[PDB]
From Swiss-Prot:
Top-level EC class as recorded in UniProt: hydrolase
Chain ranges of the Peptidase A1 domain: 17-328
Parent-protein residues present: 90 to 419 of 419
Catalytic activity: Hydrolysis of proteins with specificity similar to that of pepsin A, prefers hydrophobic residues at P1 and P1', but does not cleave 14-Ala-|-Leu-15 in the B chain of insulin or Z-Glu-Tyr. Clots milk
Species assigned in the record: Cryphonectria parasitica (Chestnut blight fungus)
Cystine connections: C255-C290
Name of protein: Endothiapepsin
Biological-process GO terms, alphabetical: proteolysis
Source species, domain of life: Eukaryota
Length: 330
């Protein structure tokens, strides 16, 4: 089997991407944030504290003839950005782009933090990291991909995120028309539960490539590119007037600037992030100070190849017995 679904930016900055997901019988379609940095599939629901729902579409398990309470199971998650959610668990039928899993754990939110409430466009998350990170207790549950894997034509999914445009998540096949050149594959460590890999270096603009190992995670649920302070300083030093602002919470730059590209290495291959992808617009409405898309990972504890990086590539998440990651230009 295979599946193919379009993923769409939630706003004009590509702050996140939503993908429609069918849950239950008859189908209830919710728009979920596919997150390769976590492993829970959770949704706004009829159980979510009413004051914490503001415009989201909710899953109502009582209206699904295939929903079953997973007795005694609870979940609770906290994300890198400080947001969180928790609740109980149902199993139900879940379909993505024509690919159907029966008995998928659907984690129903009883509580969500303010950032989730305040984002009316995201109805929940669909985790695509390794199932060892799943938070369901006392019986850990499998991700949608993990459940689908044996049925897939090939044990892979691909992320093809757009810049200010829709893109695609495919399951079970590699669309050879979706990228240019060849796909370069690179080793993955699953030791921390992430799609963790090592970039071979970077360049700023038309500058020379610096060979240096940068360990980080491929994370579709993180907006920006978070890299070591040395790398980030070298990037922003090429932008007149750019500076790190503690008050704003990162590097900012004059909105009048033309940003240089940023290249990262994948083995001997190179992925080029155009300068425009690094612009996250005014820090506040009407400001001429703009927020940068490359930020320091210092004090996160890990480097994160988030959407800024991933949307410059066609990315293969290869869930074979020994997982690997592939990157192609597009």
């Amino acid at each position: 089997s295979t599946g193919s679904a379009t993923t769409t930016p939630i706003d004009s900055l590509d702050d996140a991407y939503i993908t429609p997901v069918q849950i239950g019988t008859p189908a209830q379609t919710l728009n979920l944030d596919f997150d390769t940095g976590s492993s829970d599939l959770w949704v706004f629901s009829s159980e979510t504290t009413a004051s914490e729902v503001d415009g989201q579409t909710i899953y109502t398990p009582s209206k699904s003839t295939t929903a079953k309470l997973l007795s005694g199971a609870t979940w609770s998650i906290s994300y890198g950005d400080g947001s969180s959610s928790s609740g109980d668990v149902y199993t139900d039928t879940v379909s993505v782009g024509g690919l159907t899993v029966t008995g998928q754990a659907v984690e129903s939110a009883k509580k969500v933090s303010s950032s989730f409430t305040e984002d009316s466009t995201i109805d929940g998350l669909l985790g695509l990291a390794f199932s060892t990170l799943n938070t369901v207790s006392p019986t850990q549950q499998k991700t949608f991909f993990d459940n689908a894997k044996a049925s897939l034509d090939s044990p892979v999914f691909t992320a093809d995120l757009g810049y200010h445009a829709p893109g695609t998540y495919n399951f079970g096949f590699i669309d050879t028309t979706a990228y240019t050149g060849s796909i370069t594959y690179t080793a993955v460590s699953t030791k921390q539960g992430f799609w963790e890999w090592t970039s071979t270096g970077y360049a700023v603009g038309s500058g020379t490539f610096k060979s240096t190992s940068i360990d980080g995670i491929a994370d579709t649920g993180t907006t920006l590119l978070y890299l070591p302070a040395t790398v980030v300083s070298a990037y922003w030093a090429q932008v007149s007037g750019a500076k790190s602002s503690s008050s704003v919470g990162g590097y900012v730059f004059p909105c009048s600037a033309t940003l240089p590209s940023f290249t990262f290495g994948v083995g001997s291959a190179r992925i080029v992030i155009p300068g425009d992808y690094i612009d996250f617009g005014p820090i506040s409405t009407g400001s001429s100070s703009c927020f940068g898309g490359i930020q320091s990972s210092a004090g996160i504890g890990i480097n994160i190849f988030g959407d800024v990086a991933l949307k410059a590539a066609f990315v293969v998440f290869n869930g074979a017995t020994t997982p690997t990651l592939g990157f192609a230009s597009k």
